[PDB]
Every structure is written in C-alpha cells, then in structure tokens.
Amino acid sequence: YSEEEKYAFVNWINKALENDPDCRHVIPMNPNTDDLFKAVGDGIVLCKMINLSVPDTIDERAINKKKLTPFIIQENLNLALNSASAIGCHVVNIGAEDLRAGKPHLVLGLLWQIIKIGLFADIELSRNEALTLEELMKLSPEELLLRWANFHLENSGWQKINNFSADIKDSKAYFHLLNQIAPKGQKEGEPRIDINMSGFNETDDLKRAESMLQQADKLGCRQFVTPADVVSGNPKLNLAFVANLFN
Template identity: 50%
Template sequence: MEATGQKLHKVDGLTTLGENGIVHTICDEEEVAFSNWINNNLSDDGDLVQLLPLDPQSQELYTKINDGLILCKLINLAVRDTIDERVINKKNLNTYTKLENLTLSLMSAQAIGCAIINIDADDLFKGKPHLVLGLLWQIIRIGLFNQIDLSNVPGLLRILDKDENVESLRKMSPEDILVKWVNYHLEKAGCGKKLGNFTNDVQDSVIYTHLLHQIAPKGSGVGLGPLSVDGNVDRAGAMLEEAEKIGVREFVSAGDVSNGVYKLNLAFVANLFNKYPSLPEPDVEEVELIVAADKESREEKTYRNWMNSLGVSSCVNWLYADLQNGLVIFQLYDIIQPGVVNWKKVVQTFRKLQSMMEKISNCNYAVELGRELRFSLVGIQGKDLYDGNRTLTLALVWQLMRAYTLVILSQCTHANDGKLVGDKDIIEWANQKLTASGKESSIKGFQDSTISNGRAVIDLIDAIAPGSIDYEMVKDQGESKLSNAKYAISSGRKIGAKIYALPEDIVEVKPKMVMTVFACLMARDYSGTKN
C-alpha cells in the first residue's frame, strides 16, 4: 500500500478505441528515482553519451527513451545478455529504426517476465508517462531481485528460523526474503524493532539507520547519529548521508522515506542487500545443503517468465510453490480459452485448517480442465501439483504454454474453424517461406540437428522481414552456433515475434522451445504487424 504524501500529477490518456479520456496519476518521485538509477548505472555506456545524464527534474526521461537505446541497455543491466547488442540500431536513427528498437525492448522485456499488456512501441515512442514508468519499474525490479537467492548469496541460510530449511526459502517471495534479511540484522544489532512492511515501518528511518550501521564495512564511518535528529524528514536526510558513505543512496529521497513510498523503499532495501548482504558464509554442512538443492533450470525460468508476462495476479517466483494452490493455473486456462474456468468451483481464499484440502481440490479441478482441453495428463493428479512434483508439474505447464502459443497462432492465421494449427502446419509454412524467399535452409522437424547453427531461424526472419538480417553477423566457423542463436533470438524479437526461448535452446535443439520459436515467427508473419 502506498503511503500518503507523495507528489502526484495527472496526465491525460486516450484509449485506442476513442472512448472518453482517461486520467492517469504519475508519481514524481518515481520519475526522479528511475532517472537517477539510469544515470548511475548506464552513464559509462558509450552508446548513450548523447542521452545521459537525464535531468531528473525536467521529465526528459519520457523523450529520451523514445529511441529504445536506454530501454535495451536497461534490460541487459537487469538480465545480462538478454539482447544481442549487434541487433540494436545505434546510429543515424529515424522514426522506423527507433520503433524497431522499442519493439525489440518490449519483446525482450516480455521474455524476462515483464507484463506488457496494452502497451506497444508507439506508446513508448510518444513517451506516455504511466506506461513508461510502469515498464521501467518492472525492468528495474527484475534486475534488483535477480540476485536475491542462494546461488548468489549462500549466506541467506543464516536468516532462516530454526524450523525452516532451503525449501522454505524457495517458497518466499523476494520481498519476504528482504524483510527476513532486515530483521536478521536488526536482531544482531539489538535494535528491538522489526520490519513488517516497506511503508509505515520505515518512515521514521530508525530501522534504516540501524541496518546501515550493521551492514556497513568496518572503517566506513557509518554511524547511528541520525537517531538523535528530530523529525522524520530531517532524520531521513541524515540517514541518507550515512548511506552515501558506502554508495547506497539510491532510489529514495528523505521525503520518499518519510512518506513511506512502497516501490522506492523496496528498491532501496533490495539495492542495500545486493551491495552489502553482510551474511556469514555457510559452513561445510550448509554448503552441502545448497549444492544438493536443485537450481532453477532454463526451462523452469522460461515458463516462469512466460506466466509473469501474461500479468497473472500473483507473481510467480518459484514455479512449484506458486502453482501449488492452482490459482495461477486457472488464470492461464482463462487466457487460453476465456470462460473455460468455472470460478464457482475454485477456492480463492483458503481457510487455515482446511487449506491443504482446498488447494488439492483446486489442483484436481486444474487437471480436470486440462483433460477437457485434451492435454495428455496420464498419471497426473491434483496431489502431484500440490506436492510440487517437478516432472508432472512441468508436463502440465508445457502443455499450457504450447496451447497458449497455438491459440495465438491460430488467431493470427484466422483459423477460426475450432481447429488449432499443428506442428506439421508450422514446419510446412517455414519451409515454404524459406523456399519462396530463395533461402537454402530448411527443417525436417523441431528435432532437426541442423537447427543448432541458427541458420534456419535467421533465414526465416529475413524471409518474413526482408533486409532485417545483417548476414555479416552470421558466422559458420568456430564457436558460431551460440553467437548465431543469440543473433537469431534478438532479431526475431526486433521484428515483433514474442519469443520466450533462449539461445541455448536453439543450439541444443530443445524441441519444445524450438517449436515455440517457429510458431511465434509464423504468428508474426501472419499478423503482418510489429506488436
């Protein structure tokens, strides 16, 4: 919940259907915080010399992101190598090449889990404030939260209670982990206070002052002086001066702290954690626990990002924990086939004593719906989803993603006869498109080993959007496969294909993900527009 006291202004927005004007409320603090974050993290990028620094007070954030360069760089800052730099238009930009960059940034943002519903390249080109800030927050949040896990910070085991384990940590959201991390340090500091939220609990800066003092390196000069300052705003200012000593004065002003602005205080704490987790390294026994714990696979990450990009109401952080109650699965069914879910059968608020049975009941209904949609769910029961059985959960999730992809494709091809486009249709289309464009490459199926060099995908993209590929970038020697695959994925996104797969999926010829790549390119070809 946002605290009061924020500086807000209103901007007019018009719907695409020509309805009455809609008024959007913009948070001035976010404009300033995001501008400063961009300046501090991208100022050394030679491609942005003409754009940075942004003036946080002038609203030029909205005009300077309209060529897509800042957004592309920010996405790569959040999730390294998401966008192949070779694909970004960087020089002599005109309206068309700017829109290409913006399309590339939107498709790439979607691929890392940003919900980009009702936003397109033209909205960003026009600098619509509420849409720009909404997208920037999602990208920045993903970047900040990426490091909050055991693989990056093994010492996170230290924040767990006695009755908790590695699996408990996985089930926590990044926000919950940050709260536990802060409280761990407050207890070590003997503070006597506990953090419960990022709004009211931080307004007096007492927690922040103790936290900074506890995590700061020895000899940094960070002290508890702000505690003796009267007034929340002045105390927050003094606290931020202490933060400045160790280079963590990011996202918040004194007013943002004293007003309890949720997003910015959350970002402030996440940045503190990323720079100074200050947790003891695990011992030998604990290291064994961490090593034994399965890490998120590429496939799991792709599914998670896909779900989040569709705007499911509960953010998916760990696939098995967050699908356990069935609610996200029902939302996906409703997106794939609107109206298929009978929500009267779904328990949405769980009672403490009955929650296990209610969640299993939901999962049973989820499996039942899958069978109605002709999913292959042999041997899968609701209890398997509730228990987080990886193999069986992934079997359902893949079929959800496949169904979604084919529904979108069928809509684009105008196949409204109730029959979905199938694998054979996609392969036939790809080969016909390649042949008609004079390309030498072809595919026999989604397991065709020749796909691994990326050539077929690259040629197909050029066939869909002639001239979109710079063939000087395409290599046939040495370590060229991964390079070609990276170029192919980003090039596909640049022409508006909603590709979630990763370059490694092409190199390793993972048939499931390869199928989605070709299906998304086919949808892009039939739509004829750069979404």
C-alpha cells in the first residue's frame, strides 16, 4: 500500500479533526505507524470526515460515540459506507468488516475519495465573481485548476505548466504560485504574508522542495506532499496540494 498516502492522509486528518471532542481518543495519529488503520475501526473518524467534505451528510446525533459494543460499531461503519456511496464514492467493493479489520488499500482508497470530494467541491461551489463564464463553468475541477495556476504563472513571468506531476518536480512553478497566491493585506482583516523566494536557487531539487514547502507552511498550506513526493511527481498527492492552495 502507499506509505506516502498513508502519511499524507494522517497529517491532513490530524489537522482537520484537531479540535473535535469526539475523536480525542484517536487524534493525533502517528503518521509513521499503522495507527491510521486501527484508528478508523470505530466509524467515528470516517463519519466526521464525510461531513467535512459534504456538510450535513450525517447527523451528529446518528454517530455513536459512547459505550461502543461490536454492534454499535458496525452501525457506525455501515452508516459511513452508505453515506459515502451517497456522496459519490465507489465503495461497492467494501463492507464494514474490511474497515473493521483495517485493510490498507481499502482504507486509503476510501479516504482519498472523501478527501478529493471535499477538495474539488470548493473549486466548484465557489467562484462566479471569481473567474463565457458559462463555458468556464463546464470546465472540470482539474482543468479549472490548471487554468488558475497558469494564470498566476504568467503574471509572474514564469512558463506555464500542463500538469501537476512532471511539470512541478523542481518546485520552480510552485514557488511563483505561492508567491502570487499569498495574502496582500487587502480584505476584512487578513494581513499580508510575503514569502521568501530564496531557496528557489537551491540547486538540489530535494532541498528546493523543502524550502518551497517551508514557505507553503507560512500560508498554512504545507499539506499532502513532502519534498520526496514533490520530486517524484506523485500525481495524486501533488493534485491535492494544489487544490488545497485554491481551497
């Protein structure tokens, strides 16, 4: 199974459910161990995540938290599966038992589907003034994102990209992106954040991804990729990192 996805998903979930009063028994998880696989076994985390991607999908009142017997748990699990299928996940290949047993590929497969949904949703249910608009509307989340990236990419005089894997491996594009995407101080009350462009000339691709990521952190966006995932052009993890900068 992908250790890189496991790790990425742990740090995302730890951040997402940091202050949830119902997950204190399991959050923060250790990204280097297989506790992501055991943590999922009671259904609570999954249900919670579903509502983060699509609000009001599961009633909190319907999730069982206290005194979890085996039956209560499978109820939690089946509820997670039925609701996820309902928001668009392809989960026909999994039942409560597989989750209860923490099967890697299955757990990582379901988690991604829920995460992607919430990542892409914001790009969808958010724009209008932010943009024939009707035609741009008929544009998929991923293409709309490349359109959005390339926009900032040219406003900074850097060349455009055609993808988020092979094209982003050296961090030079991500650097100008962060640079253009950073707060400028003009709003209700969000202060400017200027990012350090040194690191851009790091020479070692891996040392530049670290520097780039160090800057993404200032924005609160150091998620989904590690220097290694940036340099290997991981498509899934690099797509999620970019969608999050939009989001």
